């Protein structure tokens, strides 16, 4: 009889066929082995479904009332604090929370659609923890406060600083204490293109685009310092950012 519904954050629900004498609709699921049960409002697979882990922690599934999004929490035996929540939007980015014993945030795991993530750990009541940007191919490493996420790559006297402000503005900045001007970097970022401009003896090397697919690529300038050559080169490894930066 029931209807199986696909949902985000590849789970499934069960949805009764027909409505009980209140008018609603019984809810089944099963998440890696726990059996959920609830009761709905709707007869299309939304609504709110409960259970528990082997431990006795409270579990519930949330499912928006247009199948958009759905919710997963974990919560102390007595259904009082939260202890993890998982939230898949409707994009299928999602946000994974894990709280200490006070129900604040300790640890948050950002998934983007496209699979790349930031990882904040460590996250203290200020809001200031550590930080990770797991890319393909390779892993920014920096730090957390209220204001922005910094995320930073060091190669000779150069340090490279990514950062993502608390609203997701991305801008990047080089500062070089290299005393000699022959070879001193300096760079300016293009918010238009998303793209960090190196000059050497003032003339432009280096066009480094921090792409929308959440990738970097590197394109030289020709020795005029005005006019690109070749073709952009997609970054694959850290080690490639670093060459970017001699």
Same mark, same amino acid.
């Given at each position: 009889n029931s209807v199986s519904v696909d949902l985000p954050g590849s789970m499934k629900v069960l949805v009764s066929k027909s409505s009980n004498a209140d008018g609603?609709?019984?809810?089944?699921?099963?998440? %890696? $082995?726990?059996?959920?049960?609830? @009761?709905?409002?709707?007869?299309? +697979?939304?609504?709110? /479904? #409960?259970?528990? !882990?082997? %431990? $006795?922690?409270?579990?519930?599934? @949330?499912?928006?009332?247009?199948? +958009?999004?759905?919710? /997963? #929490?974990?919560? !102390?035996? %007595?259904?009082?604090?939260?202890?993890?929540?998982?939230?898949?939007?409707?994009?299928?980015?999602?946000?994974?929370?894990?709280?200490?014993?006070?129900?604040?945030?300790?640890?948050?795991?950002?998934?983007?659609?496209?699979?790349?993530r930031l990882e904040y750990t460590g996250i203290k009541s200020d809001g200031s923890g550590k930080a990770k940007e797991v890319l393909?191919?390779?892993?920014?490493?920096?730090?957390?406060?209220?204001?922005?996420?910094?995320?930073?790559?060091?190669?000779?006297?150069?340090?490279?600083?990514?950062?993502?402000?608390?609203?997701?503005?991305?801008?990047?900045?080089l500062n070089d204490t290299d005393s000699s001007a022959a070879t001193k970097k300096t760079a300016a970022w293009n918010s238009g293109t998303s793209t960090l401009t190196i000059t050497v003896n003032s003339k432009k090397t280096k066009d480094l685009v921090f792409t929308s697919s959440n990738t970097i690529t590197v394109q030289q300038y020709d020795s005029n310092g005005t006019s690109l050559e070749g073709s952009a080169v997609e970054i694959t490894k850290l080690d490639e950012i670093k060459n970017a930066l001699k």
């Open positions: 609603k609709y019984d809810l089944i699921a099963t998440v %890696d $082995a726990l059996e959920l049960s609830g @009761t709905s409002d709707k007869n299309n +697979g939304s609504g709110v /479904l #409960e259970g528990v !882990k082997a %431990d $006795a922690s409270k579990v519930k599934l @949330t499912i928006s009332d247009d199948l +958009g999004q759905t919710t /997963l #929490e974990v919560f !102390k035996s %007595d259904g009082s604090t939260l202890v993890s929540k998982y939230v898949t939007s409707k994009d299928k980015s999602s946000t994974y929370e894990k709280f200490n014993e006070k129900g604040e945030v300790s640890e948050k795991y950002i998934t983007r659609a496209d699979g790349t393909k191919g390779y892993v920014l490493e920096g730090t957390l406060t209220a204001e922005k996420t910094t995320l930073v790559v060091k190669e000779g006297t150069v340090t490279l600083s990514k950062n993502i402000s608390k609203s997701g503005e991305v801008s990047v900045e």
